[PDB]
């Protein structure tokens, strides 16, 4: 057997999946995840895949720092993964502008508060439910010159010249963050 390597975390909106190498040739794998002071919980028992969804475990407390190790079979050979703190590292999905209504000389651009994988009381919590104040959306629009705008909620109330038309784009951003502070730009929409 060959111990796994290059273990990488793939997470977006808390949908977290640990990946690794190489392409299993006579060896099966078993993953274990835990918190610095927790017990080790196994996952993806004897899988032949080089991936493992750990979403259900990490969403139990997105503020914890989980470590993971991949066990290799033909104590067994294993390789530890990088530490993973969901809340501080999960990638923010691509935003989607829900709409925008005009009211005279101002526009109300609304950001769709997408849902996350974090389960809470039989439902999926939204990005706002989780990050609360840590989350802001920035607007990059233009008169169909660049313009920006930031909001602490899921809406933008902006001034626009009557007659002229505008196109819009937004981004999810967790200012405090150091890693993955922004999501990719949402699809462009014009009134």
């Amino acid at each position: 057997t060959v111990a796994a390597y290059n273990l990488t975390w793939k997470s977006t909106n808390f949908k977290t999946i640990l990946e690794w190498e190489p392409k299993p040739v006579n060896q099966v794998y078993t993953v274990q995840i835990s918190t610095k002071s927790g017990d080790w919980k196994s996952k993806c028992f004897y899988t032949t895949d080089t991936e493992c969804d750990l979403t259900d475990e990490i969403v139990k407390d997105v503020k914890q720092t989980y470590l993971a190790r991949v066990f290799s079979y033909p104590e067994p050979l294993y390789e530890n993964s990088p530490e993973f703190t969901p809340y501080l590292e999960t990638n923010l999905g691509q935003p989607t502008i829900q709409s925008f209504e005009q009211v005279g000389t101002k526009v109300n651009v609304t950001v769709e508060d997408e849902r996350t994988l974090v389960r809470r009381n039989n439902t999926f919590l939204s990005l706002r439910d989780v990050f609360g104040k840590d989350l802001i959306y920035t607007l990059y629009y233009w008169k169909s010159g660049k313009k920006t705008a930031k909001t602490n909620t899921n809406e933008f109330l902006i001034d626009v010249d009557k007659g002229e038309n505008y196109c819009f784009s937004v981004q999810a951003v967790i200012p405090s963050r150091t890693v993955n502070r922004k999501s990719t730009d949402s699809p462009v929409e014009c009134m």
Binding site: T12, N13, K15, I17, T30, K41, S42, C44, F45, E51, D53, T55, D56, G93, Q94, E114, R115, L117, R119, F124, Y140, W142, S144, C167, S169, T184, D185, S186, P187, V188, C190
Partner: protein
């Protein structure tokens, strides 16, 4: 798309990209500006990866740029919700839910057992003492 003579008409994102499929050029003609064209074309040309309907067992696919995300039903998990959280009654998975000893079995379901001094209750998972001082228990705390 480009029908005959329609190009004589100014550009409209609606008639051109919403109401029909618009190439990069048609889009570049509506937006004019390079960056504006590229910011639009990234999402416009990415293609909805949820088309394959990858999410299984009644999951829900949420499209992303060159990827998707599956939101599963309680009893499932895995990139595409292919994992049956009910099909994992083996001993290495949480000791098979057994209180003390677990014994896997080919095909069938695992069986639980207990240490000397204990017995298995009718739930087939728990153990209770059959002596006054079973091993592992702290009297002044029981």
């Amino acid at each position: 798309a480009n029908a005959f003579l329609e190009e004589l008409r100014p550009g409209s994102l609606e008639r051109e990209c919403k109401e029909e499929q618009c190439s990069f050029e048609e889009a570049r003609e509506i937006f004019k500006d390079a960056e504006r064209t590229k910011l639009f074309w990234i999402s416009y040309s990415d293609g909805d990866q949820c088309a394959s309907s990858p999410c299984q067992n009644g999951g829900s696919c949420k499209d992303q740029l060159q990827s998707y995300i599956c939101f599963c039903l309680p009893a499932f998990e895995g990139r595409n919700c292919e994992t049956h959280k009910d099909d994992q009654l083996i001993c290495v998975n949480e000791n098979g839910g057994c209180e003390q000893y677990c014994s896997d079995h080919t095909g069938t379901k695992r069986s639980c057992r207990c240490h000397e001094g204990y017995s298995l209750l009718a739930d087939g998972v728990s153990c209770t003492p059959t002596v006054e001082y079973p091993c592992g228990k702290i009297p002044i705390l029981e």
